[model samples]
Target: ASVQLQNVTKAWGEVVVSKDINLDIHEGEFVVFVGPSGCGKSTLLRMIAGLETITSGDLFIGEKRMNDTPPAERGVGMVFQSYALYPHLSVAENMSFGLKLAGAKKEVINQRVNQVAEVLQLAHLLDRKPKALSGGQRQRVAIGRTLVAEPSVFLLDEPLSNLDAALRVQMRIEISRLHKRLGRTMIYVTHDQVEAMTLADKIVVLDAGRVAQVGKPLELYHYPADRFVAGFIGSPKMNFLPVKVTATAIDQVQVELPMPNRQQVWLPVESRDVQVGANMSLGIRPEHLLPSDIADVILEGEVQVVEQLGNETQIHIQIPSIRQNLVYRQNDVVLVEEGATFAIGLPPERCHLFREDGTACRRLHKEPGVAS
Candidate 1:
């Protein structure tokens, strides 16, 4: 089923958490809501589930208004962060509990439970109690319970939060496969970037209780709308350096990087409003900062820390006038030592520029796989 929120707002007295929010969730799309704590992701999810009331605005499911609808009539199934299973109930009993309460026939409940269990690989654990199951198994049972109900939409609120790291990966894969097999609309809420990026067909990034940006994972990654989205979407975060605009053109801006070893580079972006001598920020991802020897634009810094993982290397380098250390990442071993003068490369085409107000200067060059 398709879900739509038009100008939604949630508040308590003067504290408005979700402010004039709007979204169109299409049928069978896997959408993820991601943000920091207290950003209202779960609040938005609950509003859709009818667990929380909307202060104002309209909600539609399957093209019908759902604001006043009861939770059971909403055709939505929710799996929470907590695997709220009955300890005394067996896996099959737990999966069929809701159906049993609704007065479903014995054969119907049994059929649904068996079908869901087969898909979730919980068939062998049908007779086991919640305590006898592993975290992953318990989580599967929770999902199986929802799957048996077979709602048109699935609302998952940090469903893997209680699992260990390795188990999280395994369950994520399982969830993705389940979504593919079932082809239902799924709205997942999580603060974990890895989960959001991997599981979402479309990502809705929230900031301070408002929708910051919404796009495909790669679109958000390659062309974030603002500095906040740019900084929030990447792991280890994007490196930011203070810059002074030295020159501006219709499609490019030349800015002086931080001082002490100041270098100037002409960046490819929409710079029509960028005035000469204006202050801005230049953002580059750790992976894009290349080896100095092969790059045209180079900046020198003192190596502060070096982390050598088997498959890759990460180096934190501190430039003289830059307030924060910039991280450099590469897929191969970096033999550079800490405390030594290290030079890194900045690729102009892969860079992003932001104004004082945090609005991005749109890049003129489009990366491969990013839609035009």
Candidate 2:
């Protein structure tokens, strides 16, 4: 089964929550909708689940228009951010509640709930009430509830938000395993980019109720569609340096970096229509920055802050020409002093250039899994 949204939009009077969003979620594929808060990811998922009214556009499931379809008939089961389990009911009871409401045979309900419980490792906890279960166990039971529904599509809205940090990682693995086991079409929404990066087969990045970009995790990571996605997708945000285009070509553009002597570097990005002396922003992730001695281009800066987190070191550098501090991250801890002059490296091939409108110049150097 495939889920498609053709210009799907949602609005309340003068306020439009989702605007002309278009997406295609393939069968047995795990797609994640990710963005900052108030980006309308939840509202988009709610529209897909038939919980919210779509102001315009068509929704199709398996080539059938589902705009007027009721939530129960849509063949999609949703798991919310909250567990929303019945406190008084046992695990088995909670899992079977929907089936019972639909007047399913007692034998059918028991068989289905038991099968789902076993898959979720909740069989042993079937007799325990919500109050008696740990957070992870309770979440498994909640997922089991949706599993028992046997919907063609599974919609999860920040399902791990309520769990503690470690527990969230455990559940993330569990959910990924479940998807592999069942091979069902799953749509997940989350504000946490980490979850989106770790779990999704394809990611849909939304910004201000509009679809910002859609691609594989690494595609967005290495070749973000715009400045918003470049800044939002990574752990430590990407550093932006103001640059002026001094030369242009179809395959490369030479930009003057904000260095002490106005150093210029040629970046391998599609630069059609680029004008000379035009101001553009250069993007480079913290992890991509290297030691100045061994790197392609160098910039002079002062080390303002240093964070040594055992496995990795995060250093913030303030360039003399730039107002904002640039972050540099490395796996090994470095013996560097703060408030000292630092030389950071910028690999031209790893750099991203954004036009005045924030749209990225297509990168010419293709990383693995990223198309030309």
Candidate 3:
């Protein structure tokens, strides 16, 4: 079943958690909602599961309006951060409890319980209580309980948060495989960008209670809509530098980074709205930067820190030529020791230009004087 939320808003007293949330999730698709903590990713999921009421606007699961539907009647299965398995109940009993509560026939309950247990590879653990089961096993039982209900839509709210790192990765792969095998609509919420990137067929990034950007994972990564999305979606985040446009022509602009010795770098831009002396932001990914060569555009800075990650290393530099004293600055150039020079190179193609207002200004496809 497809899920849709149109202009949905939610509030708690005077604070708005989510506002004007308009989204459509297709049938059998896996959609992920991701953002920082307190960004309402989980709140939005709760609203869809009918555990929390929508403050305003419409919510539909398939053709049914679900805004006022009770959680039990919403026909959605939810797996939360906590596995919520009954510690005293055997796996089989836990899986059958819901059906037994509804007074299902003995044969029907047994069949459903066995079927889900087998599907989850928990048939061997059916006789074990929750305390005897490992964390992953407990999680499987929780999912098995939901599967026995046979919901058309599945909602998972950080379902793997409690597992160990290795188990989290393993279960993530298993859940992805399960989604494909069942061909059911699944909505997952998490603050982990890696989870959102690896598991989602489509990612909906939320910030400040509204949609920041929505698209395929690579699309969002390659062509982010704004500075916020660009900075938030990537690991190590994007490196940003403050610059002043020194010259602008038809197809390119020349900018200078005043720090690290007033070095100048020229970048190609499609628009001429940039004026001489106008302040702009230069964004570069860590992989796009390299240790300096004589011919490369360089920012001289002292190596403040170096993080070795087996396959790659992250070297943080502090350049004094840029802004030397901004507390909240994302990327600040640090000065190399007195007269000693430490330079880093910036590749033109991997760079992004942003206006003073933090909106990205990229070369448009049809703009005159822009190169293909």
Candidate 4:
């Protein structure tokens, strides 16, 4: 079913959690609601599940207006952060509980339970109690319970947050495969950017309850709308540098970075609104910053810390004007040791320029990724 939210808002008399939210979740698409804590991602998911009332606006599932619909009537299956299951009941009993209560025929309940168990790989653990199952196994059971309901929409709110790092990856892959196998509209809520990037067909980035930007994972990464989306979407976060526009030519601006060497970079932008001497921000990802010689070296900071992650390496180089350690990464380890001066390059076209209002200048073209 296609889920739609029109001018949706949630408030508590004086405080508004989400404002004027509008979204169209396509049928069988995996949509992720990602943002920081208290950004109302959970509340938004709960509203869709009919747990919270909308302050204003309309919600539709397929063509049906469902603002007033009850939780059970909404045909949504929810899996929460916690594995809420009965310890006394076996896995099969637990999974069949809801169908049993709803007066579903025994054959129907058994068939549904068996199907869900097979999909979730809980067939062997059907006789096992909740306490007897591992964390991942229990999580699968929790998910299987929801699956037995055969809801049109699947709402998962940080379902893997409780697991360890390794298990999280395993479950994420499982969920991704499951989503592909069962083509249903899935709205997942999580604060983890990695999860959002890996799972979402369309990513809805929420900043303080308002929609920041909505796009495919790579589109948001390569062509972000504003500083918030640019900074939020990437791992290690994008590094920022303050810059002043010195000159403006046709469809471009010449900005100077205030490092000791003072690197001047030309940004391809069509901002006629941008005034000369206007203060702006320059954003570049850690992976984008290269070691050594471009036109003029952006920075030659002292290598402060070296992080060896084996497969990938990250090194912190200190730039005087920049507050945090300016970072760069390499797939291979080289001994660019601490206390050594490291020359860096920031490609002119790769950099993002942001106006004073924190909005990024729109790129004139698409940026294809570096081939592996």
Candidate 5:
């Protein structure tokens, strides 16, 4: 089943949760909603599940409108972060409890329960109680309970939040496999970027109750629509440096990096809007900024903090030239006495230039009034 939300809006008192949401989810697609806390991702999920009323606009499951339908009647199954399994109930009993309450036939309930248990690999532990199961086992049982409903759309609200790091990765793979086996439309809401990137066929990035950007995982990672999506989608996050466009030719633009002594770097952009003296932001991913001997865009800073992770190390450098650091504004940039020149290089093709309003300047070429 496919889900569509057209101009959806939600509010609680005077606090507007989500507004102007337009999304089209294809059948059997695994979509992930990711954003920071209080971004209204969970609210959007609940609204789709019929747990919350839509303040305005239309909600559809396939071709049927579902705004007024009861949650149980919506044919949607939900799995929550808590797992919420009954401690005394055996795994089989827990999985069948929902069907039994719906007045399903005895044989039908038993057959459906067994089928889901087999799919989840929980048939061996059918007789065991929740207390006897490990954290991962308990979560599988929770998912099994939802699967027995044979729902067309599955909604997961941070279902893997309770597991440890290793267990989380393991279950992430299992959930991806289960989605493929079931071939059902799934909407997963999570704040973890790794989980979103790994499992989502399409990623919906939300910010302040609005859709920031929607695209394939790698597309958003490589060419983010805006600065927020660029910084939020990556693992180590993209680094931002204030720059001024010094010159703009037919195919490339020159930008001045005002750090570790002024130097100019050329970036290839097919934009006519780029002009000299325009204040812009230069975004470069951490992986693209490597230790190199390049001179033009080379930045030398002191290594203030080092995080060694066996395979790769994260070196935090404090550039004395950059007076304004956004995320670390409160921390004193001059405290670290270790002064060393760590050469940083930025690749021209990997650069993203954004205007002062946080929108990517490259996108201006696509506008109707702007020339390509």
Candidate 6:
């Protein structure tokens, strides 16, 4: 199913929750809505599912206006974070309950339920009750219930939230496979960046009820439209430091770092209208600013804490003048501890610059999946 939002919005009296949002979700595409709590990600999704009403603007599912259509008649199915299954009903019964209520023939219901169960690996657990199943199993049953409807579009709202870490990873892979297998349009809502980065064909980042940016997962990560996106899309968050423009050219600028030992480096960014001594921001990912002794630009910090995750180590370093800790993610474990001085290298072309008003200067290079 293809979904189009034309100036969509939601409001309560004078308090507008969503304002003039426009987006297009292509058929068979896996789109993820990600943002902080109260960012209107779920609100936007509920509006799409017809669970919430749109205050204004038009919404189309395929070619029909869906703003006033009932959810059941809109050819949409939704799975939520909570596994609200019937406690006494068997898995197969639960999966087919909706179809039965809608007057679907028993034979057809059984066939669809069995097919969905087989794909979700719930064939063995079909006879069990909800309380007898694990969190992941219960969630799968919920998804199966939705799948039996055979809706053209699927909406999942944090369906894996109740699962543990290992199960979350397993379910993430399962959902990715399901998306490919079904080839149906899916709109998933989550706050987990790892989930958004791994599962989404396109990512919709929301902030304060407004659509912050919409692009392929890699496009937003590599070339964020503004500071909010640059800071939001990556794990451990992107590092931001205050800087001052010391020199400028038609296509580049030299910015002086605010480190104790002042350092200035040239970056490839549009500087046509930027003036000297103007306040700017330097953005770099932790993975790109690893510890290196012979790099062109260096910043000194004292190791505040170290997290060892086998294949990689996350070193949180407290800088001398900066109020925030600068994180460095080394691919492999290295010797470093709290109170130890560390040096970080920042490559010019790999960094990002944001203006005083928060819009970013486009980067010269773009990567599909930036490692950090």
What's the CA RMSD for each of the models?
Answer: 1.7, 1.7, 5.2, 2.5, 5.3, 2.5
Clash totals, every prediction: 0, 0, 11, 0, 0, 0
lDDT of 5 by residue, 1-372 (tens): 899999999989998899889999999999999999889989999999998999999999988999999988888988888777775678988987579888899899988888877667888888888777577878888888888888989999988887789999999998988887789999999998889999999999999999999988877776678899988987887779899998887767888886656678877765466668989998877776744566445666676665555566666776677943211111112232334546566667768888778787552223232223
Q: Using alpha carbons, what is the TM-score of model 3?
A: 0.83
Cα misplacement distance, residue 100 of candidate 5 (Å): 2.6
Residue 326 Cα positional deviation in candidate 5, in Å, after optimal superposition: 12
Model 2, span 155-193: residue lDDT tens? 998888877899999999999888887788999999999
For model 1, name the residue pairs that clash. Answer: none
Cα TM-score per model = 0.95, 0.95, 0.83, 0.93, 0.88, 0.92
Local lDDT at 228 for model 6:
94
Question: lDDT tens digits, residues 1-372, model 1?
Answer: 899999999997999999999999999999999999889998999999999999999999998899999999999998887777885768988987689998889999998988877666777888888777487778888888888888988999988887789999999998998888778899999998889999999999999988999999999999988999999988889999889999987799999988765678999999966889889999999999988887687777899999999789999998777658989998879798999999888899999999998989988888887789
lDDT of 6 at 297: 85
- Global CA lDDT of candidate 2, please? 0.89
lDDT of 5 at 6: 97
For 260-315, candidate 4 gives per-residue lDDT tens digits of 55667788875667888999988889898876656444676788988888888888
Off by over 4 Å in 4: 127-132, 270-272, 293-297, 320-324, 369-372
For model 2, what is the error of residue 254's alpha carbon versus the real structure, in angstroms, after optimal superposition?
Answer: 0.5
RMSD of candidate 4 to the truth, in angstroms, is 2.5
User: How big is the positional error of residue 353 in model 4, measured in Å on the Cα after superposition?
Assistant: 1.0
Name the runs in model 5 displaced over 4 angstroms.
270-272, 293-296, 323-338, 363-372
Q: Please give the lDDT score at residue 151 for candidate 6.
A: 91
Candidate 6 regions with alpha-carbon error over 4 angstroms: 127-132, 321-323, 368-372
